[PDB]
Amino acid sequence: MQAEILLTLKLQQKLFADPRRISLLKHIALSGSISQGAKDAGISYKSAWDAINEMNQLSEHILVEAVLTRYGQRLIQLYDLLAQIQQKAFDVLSDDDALPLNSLLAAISRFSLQTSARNQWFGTITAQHVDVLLADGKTRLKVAITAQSGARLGLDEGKEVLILLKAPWVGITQDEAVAQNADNQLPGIISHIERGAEQCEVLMALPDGQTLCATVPVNEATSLQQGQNVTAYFNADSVIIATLC
Amino acid sequence: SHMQAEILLTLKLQQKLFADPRRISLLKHIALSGSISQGAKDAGISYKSAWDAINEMNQLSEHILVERATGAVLTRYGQRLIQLYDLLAQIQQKAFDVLSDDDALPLNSLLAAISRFSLQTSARNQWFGTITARDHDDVQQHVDVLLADGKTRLKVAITAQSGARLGLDEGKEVLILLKAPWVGITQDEAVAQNADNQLPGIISHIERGAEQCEVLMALPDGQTLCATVPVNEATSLQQGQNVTAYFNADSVIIATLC
Numbered sequence: 001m002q003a004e005i006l007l008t009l010k011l012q013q014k015l016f017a018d019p020r021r022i023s024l025l026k027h028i029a030l031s032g033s034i035s036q037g038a039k040d041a042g043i044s045y046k047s048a049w050d051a052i053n054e055m056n057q058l059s060e061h062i063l064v065e066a067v068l069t070r071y072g073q074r075l076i077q078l079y080d081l082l083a084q085i086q087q088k089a090f091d092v093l094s095d096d097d098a099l100p101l102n103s104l105l106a107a108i109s110r111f112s113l114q115t116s117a118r119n120q121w122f123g124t125i126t127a128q129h130v131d132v133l134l135a136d137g138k139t140r141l142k143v144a145i146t147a148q149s150g151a152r153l154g155l156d157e158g159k160e161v162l163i164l165l166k167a168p169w170v171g172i173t174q175d176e177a178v179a180q181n182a183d184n185q186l187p188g189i190i191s192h193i194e195r196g197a198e199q200c201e202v203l204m205a206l207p208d209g210q211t212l213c214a215t216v217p218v219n220e221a222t223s224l225q226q227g228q229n230v231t232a233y234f235n236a237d238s239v240i241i242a243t244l245c
Numbered sequence: 246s247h248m249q250a251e252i253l254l255t256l257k258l259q260q261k262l263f264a265d266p267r268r269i270s271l272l273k274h275i276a277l278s279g280s281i282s283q284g285a286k287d288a289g290i291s292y293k294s295a296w297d298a299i300n301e302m303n304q305l306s307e308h309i310l311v312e313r314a315t316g317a318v319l320t321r322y323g324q325r326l327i328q329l330y331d332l333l334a335q336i337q338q339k340a341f342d343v344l345s346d347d348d349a350l351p352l353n354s355l356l357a358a359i360s361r362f363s364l365q366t367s368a369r370n371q372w373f374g375t376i377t378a379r380d381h382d383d384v385q386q387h388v389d390v391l392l393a394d395g396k397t398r399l400k401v402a403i404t405a406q407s408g409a410r411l412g413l414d415e416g417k418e419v420l421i422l423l424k425a426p427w428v429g430i431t432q433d434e435a436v437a438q439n440a441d442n443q444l445p446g447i448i449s450h451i452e453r454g455a456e457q458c459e460v461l462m463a464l465p466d467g468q469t470l471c472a473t474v475p476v477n478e479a480t481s482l483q484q485g486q487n488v489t490a491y492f493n494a495d496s497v498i499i500a501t502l503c
């Protein structure tokens with residue numbers, strides 16, 4: 001379904017920007033002149049001046065110096081942003097199976113935003129740190145974070161969070177006495193071990209479905225076997241937690 | 246920081262005008278009033294143009310926006326259209342404030358909009374940048390990142406595989422998520438000269454606490470670096486002090502859209 005968005009900006013109750021003025025600016029950038037610009041954009045020369053002069057006055061910047069100033073370019077960038085996201089916005093709107101729309105930036109960023117952390121899990125703030133319940137419903141974590149960063153992330157009971165944990169920040173132990181003194185403990189079964197000259201990648205099947213990745217010094221992985229039940233452990237302050245609002 | 250823009254959006258579907266200010270305003274007054282006719286009158290539009298608008302919006306969207314109360318109410322879709330419109334308008338208003346205030350991120354970038362307006366993380370550093378050419382002919386397991394001045398360079402560790410999957414080719418936009426306690430702050434160049442990454446600067450703000458001192462410095466592109474250093478190790482620091490921030494390449498997590 002063809003779909004588009006048109007934007008008009010008004011300042012002080014008057015007309016500041018509208019597609020025809022943005023097209024005037026872009027034809028000005030292209031042509032290197034106001035008169036050629038107006039012609040390409042389809043308006044009179046005097047009307048191109050009236051628009052540029054009104055824009056300058058209402059915004060209190062200078063938009064055209066012919067070249068555009070920085071302020072002028074970024075005004076076009078603000079239009080280009082809208083045009084970058086419209087099709088995502090229309091797809092969010094037409095999504096008959098979605099729950100109610102809370103945050104359009106969070107909706108368009110839930111499934112596209114990816115990270116380089118090999119462990120990337122979803123959770124909710126359950127009731128200096130916060131506790132997080134993972135999405136398969138049983139696993140709890142403790143995440144070190146001040147009351148104030150918690151406030152800046154919007155950490156309320158139930159807020160969805162993204163939890164990030166590099167593989168080399170994860171310890172792997174077969175000793176319950178080591179694991180029990182860790183902040184976070186995730187029992188699981190080793191499903192793959194890959195031994196290199198300095199490092200060993202461990203993948204572990206967590207009881208509830210996802211696969212945890214740890215990267216440990218090889219000499220610490222010597223007795224480990226695929227099939228074996230072990231415990232992954234990490235400090236509360238190793239985890240990065242993110243929210244989208 | 247002054248002057249809020251008034252945002253006027255028009256959505257068009259199938260080459261036709263679908264929703265504009267007047268139509269969204271009609272649907273909110275319908276929701277507020279409980280009826281088409283009181284809602285059209287509150288929105289300042291006649292009864293007939295009100296139903297002409299709703300019949301059109303239904304036909305274009307392939308949904309029903311308004312239905313008789315089981316009195317008129319918005320359906321799920323009528324509510325979703327108003328929500329999406331108003332969130333969209335709010336994103337253009339915040340973008341306008343960015344234009345007015347300035348910053349060095351591109352204002353056309355979606356990742357930069359997410360970073361400014363939606364994403365927050367516990368790491369405290371969340372810098373915008375772009376994948377740039379490796380800075381050595383030899384392949385190493387790291388990407389190079391330029392900050393928004395297109396000049397200040399960082400290295401981040403990652404494998405070719407996770408780099409590939411994330412689409413990390415020249416020009417890809419990423420965020421650098423770097424915990425504050427993993428950032429050093431030094432007045433001694435040699436100390437920092439031993440780390441993968443050094444970012445010179447000036448302390449723009451210092452806060453001291455019993456165990457940790459928080460330091461804030463402007464990166465050369467305007468973005469803000471935050472570091473948390475042991476108060477033992479921060480006793481000689483002060484605002485305006487010229488400083489170098491330093492960190493390992495494997496301390497970073499890269500975020501990017503895929």
Ligand code: NI
Pocket residue numbers: 379380381385387388389400
């Ligand atoms: Ni490099």
